[PDB]
Design a binder for these strands. Sequence first.
RNA 1: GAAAAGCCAGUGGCGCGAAGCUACCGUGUGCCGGAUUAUGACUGAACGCCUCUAAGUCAGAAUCCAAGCUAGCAUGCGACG
Length: 185
Amino acid sequence: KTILASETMEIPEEVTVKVSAKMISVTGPRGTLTRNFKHLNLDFQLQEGGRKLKVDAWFGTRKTMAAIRTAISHVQNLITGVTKGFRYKMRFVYAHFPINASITAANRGIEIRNFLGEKKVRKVDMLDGVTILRSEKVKDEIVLDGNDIELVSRSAALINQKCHVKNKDIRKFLDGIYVSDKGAI
RNA sequence: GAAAAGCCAGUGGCGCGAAGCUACCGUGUGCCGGAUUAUGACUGAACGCCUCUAAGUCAGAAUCCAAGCUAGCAUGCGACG
Ligand SMILES: [Mg+2]
């Protein structure tokens, strides 16, 4: 019912955005990111020669109007991911059994052992654009690095949800792997 | 006639009895991918914040559909002699 709902962002001078009808390819110093917003039913248009991305919803109801800022902050996340990158920190909480993590192959996955005294060995492989490394200036962290927030955060979530404590009081047996500093550096 | 060999008693009766069938009373074997629910989540709005949800995604089960197993006159079809 609303004639025009538009939002706009700014593109820095280190990153090149190439939008192809909704197929957004972002290029930066760190690499390249890409995404289908081919489902959003919005209007993307670059102005000032690739320095301003301006998004329209014409006759958008409040639902489509809420869909706008998703696209704008998604492409913010791509811009920051491909200029600086995302780096999640993930601390080891263990009550009685030290849980012993070992990387898999050139930092593409982790292997958790001795969790809860269990003998099942926990194996998670990093998704495409994410790597892992054990923390060395911190006591017990694993630090994930990547250019894509979805890939970093999904890998973080796999590691988290693969160390749940079952059949026991989750209010007391707090063992697991949880994320502490989630910014982007 | 008798020994020998039998035969009659609907299978005369008993001991054993191969073969064939057979028994959890004996033996051998029984199944590999993906979708997903309940739930837990990721990025992220509406609502400068938050948010598993609105758009988009994930993990997920004696579940589901295949894979496998059985029939395949489905008046179906292919190669060839
Ligand atoms: Mg016998």
